[PDB]
Write a protein that binds this DNA or RNA. Structure first.
Lengths: 171, 37, 175, 136, 144
RNA sequence: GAUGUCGGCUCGUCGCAUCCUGGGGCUGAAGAAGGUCCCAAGGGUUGGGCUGUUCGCCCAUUAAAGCGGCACGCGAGCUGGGUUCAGAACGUCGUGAGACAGUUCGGUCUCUAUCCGCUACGGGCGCAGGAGAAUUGAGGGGAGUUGCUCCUAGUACGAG
RNA sequence: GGAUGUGUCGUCGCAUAGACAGCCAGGAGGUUGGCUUAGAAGCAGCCACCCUUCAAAGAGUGCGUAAUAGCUCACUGGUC
């Protein structure tokens, strides 16, 4: 079961109906939920209470909270993942906002950030996907982590810095 | 991937999961990767 | 154990968790019907050397003893019990199990010790004071040591019904 | 396994167990919960299994020996009488019965010697321990 | 040639470490000298010879190794006092031999640098624990 | 008061427990080449020699050179080599007439399609006037294969 | 046969004097326990499975090497 709810300043919830509408310094974010899913703010902090309790319920429960709490650090602090390009001649440049891979493929890989995401590069050997929506970011750093998975013999291609990739080790 | 009728753990990892009407087996190691389907 | 009903009819129990026994002696052979669960958790402990409180509905505590029991095949679950109303000076005879303790000087030697005859029966138990158990030596036992009735220490009074030279426990060899 | 000498043939019929005790010869036991014909070879397939699992002790009992001769098709036809007295020997086993029951080894160290064995039997069983005290 | 994130530990007879079987690849594949460790072994083990003595080798990064002449193993001390030829595989069936507690006092006094138990008493029961897993028995004891 | 039989040839079509191409997990998978399990039948799956063959062995190739079903698919479609007519021979059995696990040479396989089905093509009528012509697309059909060289790159990889 | 898919009954069980899973940290010394081997040191296989310190930390989970080593576990404290 989940209940705590840190709703720091910047926020602005609006449980108006099922579109549990939100607005913060990072940009108004909206996350829908279950109506019979009871929730609003009490006193200062917040909480999503529930009707029945066992499964069909306690699940959406433990869902919504975790979800809203997100939009919080959401419009509050914004999210950003840091990827690592690794291997001989692996490197990303850029084009406007376009992430530009260069990872062994006979021709270069261009990646374009969607409606509310942004690419950044420190050294053409490390990456970053910041943004508002925790999902998308993950839901995209993926698409970048996918342009090339790490190998079981040298763990190349994109990865998660503190990524644990042991090597099979061959000949 | 291992499609076996009888799907069970094979070490203190094997994490029997249930994705779309299927019985799965995700272990930290792969050769334990199972799946009735 | 508050068994209450006791009719030739068991409908009102055959579904409702209840066993169905009979306790007697020669005087009263009262019809019976106790609860499943109770005698279920009960007999386990006292076994056939454990008399218990028999306050049948109405309140008439009676002392008896688990005589014989008949349980279901397919289902290790019991169905019918027969209680033998305790006596005073002599009951009949009792079914008493054999037990070991202390390591055997045969076990570590390389073989194992076998309790040929699990439970053992002895002539004249002596009501009120009937061994609800029986511990036996085994240590001494080596490679081919056989213990018999004539050996097991008695609980002062009790007389061994089974034949003396009958092997009770023998520390078997390896393989 | 196969008997030493007898008549030569038989028949077929069934109904729940009759003289298949429970505790005796050991502490742990295995129980057949279903009508079947246990094949003598399906017992070796059990004994020899349990064996392996027990470096020693032997404390394995097979109180189910095969008292029965079944027959076979001497290729196909149908123009001839009874046939194949020597197909194989069987041990008709009814529910509640006890084919196995080890002794001495630890519970689990026995909750496996059976598990396995089970895996070569045609029927569904389960393991048993004590409180068995009918006749002695 | 190699850093080796591990520590090298072994047990030499008295003053060999010269033949191939003993060390050899144990320090050969590492690319270093061995003719030095040999002379730097029998020289220190001069006091206590004709007895197996375990030594721990510590190699640095500059291909520099060290050693610490400790005390002989308890498994050999018993085979020297009781005159044991070889350890038995069936201590439950047939034993090996028998010694006196006096042969233990010389062990808890020499092998004391390693013994971090209590004091004497606590450093005596530990010795019997190893000898018990061998085959020999203990003489005397409490009471009597 | 008859459901024509083995094999070919022709003509196909269907299942998948996929032979090759497609996608994937694991590999004891370095790469290259493979093993193996999953998903997947769009399409494709060669020509010769021996045998009546099916089968199979073999020559030369191929991405491959799948397995089965459809009265062991298909004779009112063709053949007729095979085998269950009449001739004749050998071995074998039979005193014989004859016979056969057998072997061997020979031996007329019926122009005319009525109903369904199928491929083409017309006549009627219908589609709320009688006519000329141009179209929408409901639905439906066809096609749906693969190699090799070059480039990237003699890179990644690999002690090489 | 498989399998934290649910519904209802039974058993241990373990537990605010603060467990379970999660987390920081620890982890024993004897001993590469003896035995067997070309060796194998908690982990190919016989035997056992005790001593010492402690709040603790088992001759030992499994993974790993040619044994080493290394990586975690069973036992211990604080956070909640």
């Amino acid at each position: 079961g989940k209940q705590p709810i840190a709703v720091p300043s910047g926020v602005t919830v609006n449980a108006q109906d099922g579109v549990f509408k939100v607005k913060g310094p990072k940009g108004e974010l909206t996350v829908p939920y279950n109506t019979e899913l009871t929730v609003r703010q009490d006193g200062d902090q917040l909480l999503v209470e529930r009707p029945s309790d066992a499964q069909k319920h306690r699940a959406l429960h433990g869902l919504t909270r975790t979800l809203v709490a997100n939009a919080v650090k959401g419009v509050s602090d914004g999210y950003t993942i840091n990827l690592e390009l690794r291997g001989v001649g692996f490197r990303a440049k850029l084009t406007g906002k376009a992430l530009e891979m260069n990872i062994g493929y006979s021709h270069p890989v261009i990646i374009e950030p969607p409606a509310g995401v942004t690419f950044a590069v420190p050294e053409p050997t490390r990456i970053d996907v910041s943004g508002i929506d925790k999902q998308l970011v993950g839901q995209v750093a993926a698409n970048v982590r996918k342009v090339r998975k790490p190998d079981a013999y040298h763990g190349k291609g994109v990865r998660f810095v503190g990524e644990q990739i042991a090597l099979k080790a061959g000949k | 991937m291992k499609v076996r009728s009888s799907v069970k753990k094979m070490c203190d990892n094997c994490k029997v999961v249930r994705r779309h009407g299927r019985v799965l087996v995700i272990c930290s190691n792969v050769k334990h990767k199972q799946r009735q389907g | 154990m508050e068994l209450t009903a006791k009719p030739r009819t068991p409908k009102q129990k055959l579904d409702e968790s209840m066993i169905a026994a009979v306790a007697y002696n020669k005087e009263n052979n009262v019809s019976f019907a106790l609860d499943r669960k109770a005698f279920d958790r009960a007999f386990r402990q006292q076994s056939t050397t454990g008399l218990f409180d028999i306050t049948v509905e109405g309140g008439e505590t009676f002392p008896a003893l688990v005589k014989a029991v008949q349980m279901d095949k397919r289902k290790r679950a019991p169905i019918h019990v027969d209680f033998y109303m305790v006596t005073y000076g002599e009951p009949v005879e009792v079914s008493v199990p054999v037990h070991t303790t202390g390591r055997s000087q045969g076990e570590v030697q390389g073989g194992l010790v076998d309790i040929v005859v699990h439970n053992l029966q002895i002539v004249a138990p002596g009501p009120r004071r009937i061994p609800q158990e029986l511990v036996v030596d085994v240590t001494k036992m080596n490679i081919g040591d056989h213990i018999t009735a004539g050996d097991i220490k008695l609980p002062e009074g009790c007389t061994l019904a089974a034949d003396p030279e009958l092997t009770v426990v023998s520390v078997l060899p390896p393989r | 396994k196969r008997t030493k000498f007898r008549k030569q043939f038989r028949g077929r019929m069934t109904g729940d167990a009759k003289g298949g005790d429970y505790v005796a010869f050991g502490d742990y036991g295995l129980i057949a919960m279903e009508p079947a014909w246990i094949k003598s070879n399906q017992i070796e397939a059990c004994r020899i299994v349990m064996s392996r699992h027990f470096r020693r002790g032997g404390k394995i009992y097979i109180r189910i020996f095969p008292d029965k001769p079944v027959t076979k098709k001497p290729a196909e036809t149908r123009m001839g009488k009874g046939k194949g007295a020597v197909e194989y020997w069987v041990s008709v086993v009814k529910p509640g019965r006890v084919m196995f029951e080890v002794a001495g080894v630890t519970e689990e160290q026995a909750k496996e010697a059976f598990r396995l064995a089970g895996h070569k039997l045609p029927i569904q069983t389960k393991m048993v321990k004590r409180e068995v005290y009918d006749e002695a | 040639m190699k850093k080796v994130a591990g520590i090298v530990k072994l047990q030499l007879p008295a003053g060999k470490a010269t033949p191939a079987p003993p060390v050899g690849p144990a320090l050969g594949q590492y690319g270093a000298n061995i003719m030095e460790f040999t002379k730097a072994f029998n020289a220190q083990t001069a006091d206590k010879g004709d007895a197996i003595i375990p030594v721990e080798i510590t190699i640095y990064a500059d291909r520099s190794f060290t050693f610490i002449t400790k005390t002989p193993p308890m498994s050999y001390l018993i085979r020297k006092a009781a005159g044991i030829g070889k350890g038995s595989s069936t201590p439950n069936k047939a034993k090996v031999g028998k010694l006196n507690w006096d042969q233990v006092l010389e062990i808890a006094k020499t092998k004391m640098p390693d013994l971090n138990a209590g004091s004497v008493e606590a450093a005596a029961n530990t010795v019997a624990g190893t000898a018990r897993s061998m085959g020999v028995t203990v003489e005397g004891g409490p009471n009597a």
